[PDB]
Amino acid sequence: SSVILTNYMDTQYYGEIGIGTPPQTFKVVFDTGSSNVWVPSSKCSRLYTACVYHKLFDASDSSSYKHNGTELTLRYSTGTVSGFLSQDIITVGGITVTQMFGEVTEMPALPFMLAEFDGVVGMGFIEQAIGRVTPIFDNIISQGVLKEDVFSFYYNRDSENSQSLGGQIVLGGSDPQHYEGNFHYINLIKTGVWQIQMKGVSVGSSTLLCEDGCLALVDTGASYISGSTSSIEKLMEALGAKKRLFDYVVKCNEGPTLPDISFHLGGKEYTLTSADYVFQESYSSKKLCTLAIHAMDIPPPTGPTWALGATFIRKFYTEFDRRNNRIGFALAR
Ligand SMILES: CCc1nc(N)nc(N)c1-c1ccc2c(c1)N(CCCOC)C(=O)[C@H](c1cc(F)cc(F)c1)O2
Numbered sequence: 099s100s101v102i103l104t105n106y107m108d109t110q111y112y113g114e115i116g117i118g119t120p121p122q123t124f125k126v127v128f129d130t131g132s133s134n135v136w137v138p139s140s141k142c143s144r145l146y147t148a149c150v151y152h153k154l155f156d157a158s159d160s161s162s163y164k165h166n167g168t169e170l171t172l173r174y175s176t177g178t179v180s181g182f183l184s185q186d187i188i189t190v191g192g193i194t195v196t197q198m199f200g201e202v203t204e205m206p207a208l209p210f211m212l213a214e215f216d217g218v219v220g221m222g223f224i225e226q227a228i229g230r231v232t233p234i235f236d237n238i239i240s241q242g243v244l245k246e247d248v249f250s251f252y253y254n255r256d257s258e259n260s261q262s263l264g265g266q267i268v269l270g271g272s273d274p275q276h277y278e279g280n281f282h283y284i285n286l287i288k289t290g291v292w293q294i295q296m297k298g299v300s301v302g303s304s305t306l307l308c309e310d311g312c313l314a315l316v317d318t319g320a321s322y323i324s325g326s327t328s329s330i331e332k333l334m335e336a337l338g339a340k341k342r343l344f345d346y347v348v349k350c351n352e353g354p355t356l357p358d359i360s361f362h363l364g365g366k367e368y369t370l371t372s373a374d375y376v377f378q379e380s381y382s383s384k385k386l387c388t389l390a391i392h393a394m395d396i397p398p399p400t401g402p403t404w405a406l407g408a409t410f411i412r413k414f415y416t417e418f419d420r421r422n423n424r425i426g427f428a429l430a431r
């Protein structure tokens with residue numbers, strides 16, 4: 099099964115899912131970086147403006163709902179959400195599964211007022227599930243209908259017209275229509291996390307970063323490519339970028355010529371061009387242009403680790419293989 103994804107300014111990718119009977123629709127990001135499913139709740143106080151601006155799941159309107167009520171808190175690198183558990187049927191591109199998800203009742207304006215999506219569908223392993231709730235993909239796998247125990251991601255580049263698909267996630271396989279060449283796989287460091295070993299990161303013609311090795315989380319729920327503060331500071335000094343409150347900028351006229359940045363994964367260099375990582379909104383030398391690379395200190399056990407988000411996936415179609423605990427990359431088409 100495949101789900102069409104909408105691309106919002108190259109930083110948000112989301113698709114639709116149905117919850118309840120009748121189906122209540124929600125826009126959600128498919129996140130390999132988390133393992134729980136949650137959408138805003140009708141029980142969310144309207145004092146939380148984010149709740150006034152998003153679709154709210156209402157249990158009293160679903161005849162398939164199953165109460166539970168266990169409280170859970172979800173902590174992402176850029177924001178938190180709190181609520182309780184509930185069960186109901188979820189529709190995901192033609193597949194129906196009874197799933198336990200969180201109904202959020204606490205949704206901070208910052209950053210959720212800036213969220214185009216309503217909730218999140220974690221594609222991570224149960225080992226990372228909060229409240230030890232069974233992840234949606236596991237439940238789907240339990241049906242034994244998927245041709246393969248894998249799922250793929252395609253994140254297109256932004257488009258100023260309602261015609262190109264923002265992205266596409268395939269449940270049970272990969273779509274040849276959106277990648278060329280062959281997949282190159284890299285084994286996971288350990289099942290339970292979509293994290294692989296990275297041999298080195300190079301900026302220009304010199305592997306000046308991650309020598310001796312480092313970690314890489316392949317996170318479909320992250321807008322950018324992130325590294326530890328130390329690493330980024332160093333990488334950014336190389337590009338000649340200035341650090342601001344939340345991002346790094348470079349003079350727009352300089353963007354087009356910034357050097358290539360490469361990531362050594364499983365014996366194969368994945369190269370990004372300046373076009374691939376800077377939001378070239380202008381050419382003026384009087385305007386600042388943001389880079390799709392940020393600094394993010396992920397705490398243990400997962401971190402310290404780099405994170406390969408949408409910036410990296412836009413260029414490399416990505417397949418997540420559960421049966422073989424490996425990740426595959428192929429040039430996106
Ligand atoms: C999908 C959940 C999620 N998963 C992981 N693994 N990491 C995250 N940081 C987030 C996460 C949390 C809140 C967010 C966003 C991501 N995203 C990125 C969506 C990525 O889609 C592929 C936003 O758009 C945003 C948001 C808006 C801002 F303006 C500033 C922010 F910091 C955060 O609100």
Ligand SMILES: *[C@@H]1O[C@H](CO)[C@@H](O)[C@H](O)[C@H]1NC(C)=O
Binds near residue numbers: 165167168
């Ligand atoms: C909520 O779900 C968990 C996990 O399935 C279950 O063990 C627990 O009994 C449920 N709680 C209630 C009160 O429904």
